[PDB]
């Protein structure tokens, strides 16, 4: 039917020849580069837009980091695999462009996908073949199928493309068929990708295998319960251990369709999870509601991996809202950091920072214990480019009724602000006084122990055009573009309408990752 006994290998393309083609593209971007907001320590390609984090792994000692990437422009277009490799996860390399359409299922776009370490040792990818259902523009809809392709080397500086491996039954789904991953649970190699149903309702389904090469329709694991959700993008699944050391089971997916309901759902599309169990053979049952993984203005299409401990995710900045000035400087959209999963007593995932990313840092600069005994400001530093600034806030001390920091704060009076809100509850990223871009604000929550508790640890990372607020030692954490004017880049701690207590405030400047 439509899962082949080997691999459907149908070459239309020199893959040599339409990988040249892509190198040129990003490198001619790349020399015409505005680094007024490149990141200095954020992933991001050296020419042209990229979107969702692709190939995720660590082989042969080796942190790798794939990415959808259109070589030709600063907007999404025919999609190609971008490629940057580290040994710390701190100083990264650039590598060659990984994938370029040269497949008959993939002409039209080599889309999102996925490494495993076999029962070999050896690395696979399982990617999405994109082809227009008519072959022309979106207006047909989408014609996806599941590839399969093999490194070459442990480099992996190259691959190797076997063809299709799960075709797509055309007339049983709503053309969405995309985004796989693949992990081993007992004795079964499992598949699951994102799936639009012949009711337009966004699906999970979940193939088996004994070989990782020929796969077996299982059944639908999971189904958004929400019509409004039309597809689950770039889905994912994992073990994880609770407080008790019980297994649960963590499903994550970049929703579709829902509509905004107050602070939640805000973004064009939302990435998010529940946690909950799995039994081999049944479906998905979630213990929890949905919770977003990043409260920010742009965050989509996360994926994570296993480094052997860890489980690691890594975020795209989406933007999804116009206008996008970025979209001027020869290149569009950086990876989050990456962040370590885990779960603790509070029953709730929390992503800190990987511990790499200390090393990030060139020095430390204590501020110390600051009082803003009335409402005001006072500036940190005169101008910040790149820096990572922790903080304590004593809540039980503090009057103000907005209290944080102003970051990008340039002599035209625009500013970012990161700051505690004390008439909703929450950390807020609010961007009304930028300079450019769409503006707006994004608010993540905080449980009625955090609000209690008397004090709030922020960890802000700032960089050329973005933030990074990790709320609590990354209970919540929110990520957004942050479009700084010319000049320099004050960072400023501000007390509104009441007091501010500081228990603790320290600054690193951070280093170059090496991509710029």
Known sequence: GFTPDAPVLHEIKNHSEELTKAEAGVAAFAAKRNNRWY????????????????????????????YQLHPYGTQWGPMHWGHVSSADMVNWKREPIMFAPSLEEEKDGVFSGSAVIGDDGKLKFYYTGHRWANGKDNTGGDWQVQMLAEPDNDELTSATKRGMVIDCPTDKVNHHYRDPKVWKTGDKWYMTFGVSSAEKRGQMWLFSSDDMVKWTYEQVLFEHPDSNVFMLECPDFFP???????????????????????????????????????????????????????????????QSFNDGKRQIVYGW???????????????????????????????????????????????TVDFGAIDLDVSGEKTIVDDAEAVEIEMTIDLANSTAERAGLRVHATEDGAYTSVAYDDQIGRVVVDRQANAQGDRGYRTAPLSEAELAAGELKLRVYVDRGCVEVYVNDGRQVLSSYSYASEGPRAIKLVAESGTLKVKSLVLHHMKSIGLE
């Not at 989050?336 to 999963?341: A, D, G, K, N, S």
Request: include cysteine; hydrophobic fraction near 35%.
């Open 39 to 66: 990141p200095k320590f954020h992933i991001a390609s050296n020419g042209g837009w990229i979107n969702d984090p692709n190939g995720l792994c660590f082989y042969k000692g080796r942190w790798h980091v794939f």
């Open 317 to 363: 900045m989406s933007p999804f809202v116009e206008p996008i000035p970025m979209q001027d400087d020869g290149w569009c959209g950086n990876l989050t950091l990456p962040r370590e999963i885990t779960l603790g007593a509070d029953g709730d995932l929390h992503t800190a920072p990987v511990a790499e990313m200390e090393g990030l840092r060139e020095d």
């Open 240 to 302: 994880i251990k609770d407080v008790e050391g019980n297994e649960k089971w963590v499903i994550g997916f970049s929703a579709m369709g829902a509509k905004p309901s107050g602070f939640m759902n805000r973004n064009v599309n939302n990435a998010g999870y529940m946690i909950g169990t799995w039994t081999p053979g049944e479906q998905f049952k979630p213990e929890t509601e949905f919770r977003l993984w990043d409260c920010g203005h742009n965050y989509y299409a996360p």
